Amino acid sequence: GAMAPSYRVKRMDIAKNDEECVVNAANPRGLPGDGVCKAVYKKWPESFKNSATPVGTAKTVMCGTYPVIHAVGPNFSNYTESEGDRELAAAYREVAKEVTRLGVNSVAIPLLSTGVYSGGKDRLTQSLNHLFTAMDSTDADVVIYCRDKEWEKKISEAIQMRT
Ligand SMILES: O=C1CC[C@@H](NC(=O)c2cscn2)CN1
Ligand SMILES: [Cl-]
Numbered sequence: 001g002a003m004a005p006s007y008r009v010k011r012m013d014i015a016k017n018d019e020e021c022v023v024n025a026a027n028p029r030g031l032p033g034d035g036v037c038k039a040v041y042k043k044w045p046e047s048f049k050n051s052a053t054p055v056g057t058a059k060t061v062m063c064g065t066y067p068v069i070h071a072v073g074p075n076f077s078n079y080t081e082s083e084g085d086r087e088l089a090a091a092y093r094e095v096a097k098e099v100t101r102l103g104v105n106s107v108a109i110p111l112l113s114t115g116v117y118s119g120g121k122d123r124l125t126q127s128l129n130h131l132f133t134a135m136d137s138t139d140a141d142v143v144i145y146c147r148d149k150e151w152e153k154k155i156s157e158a159i160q161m162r163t
């Protein structure tokens with residue numbers, strides 16, 4: 001574990017992370033996809049061998065010795081708000097189990113279901129609070145990756161609020 005486990009946020013491409021493993025915002029079919037998923041496919045294509053997994057789950061595939069945790073959040077275009085909320089919380093609980101099992105000291109993580117799976121809604125707070133619920137009991141350093149300047153400020157504020 002990390003000596004003083006922390007949360008941080010950075011505004012940059014998660015494919016350039018400085019952590020011991022990465023969480024992909026995956027589709028259920030293990031396809032190259034779009035957005036974060038397509039950046040992950042370009043950087044770690046070997047990690048897409050048998051990476052298909054259902055919604056609300058995480059499946060880890062090694063690229064060399066570098067772990068890629070494929071986490072499948074719900075597409076809110078297809079799920080009800082209620083069922084989507086349940087699957088989004090579940091995906092993050094499976095990420096926490098994988099990060100623990102791998103014994104890593106740090107993990108790079110995007111906000112699940114906030115891009116093309118958002119159903120056209122702002123889900124920063126919903127997704128970030130499910131991330132905290134799952135990751136708070138882990139001792140890995142967590143580095144959250146985003147692309148938007150206003151999202152960086154809001155994520156940073158939420159981290160600092162808890163202290
Ligand atoms: O800061 C943000 C902006 C909206 C969403 N990002 C992407 O859609 C996206 C596409 S490629 C990388 N992120 C989540 N985070
Ligand atoms: Cl960048």
Ligand SMILES: [Cl-]
Pocket residue numbers: 025112113114115116117118
């Ligand atoms: Cl998404």
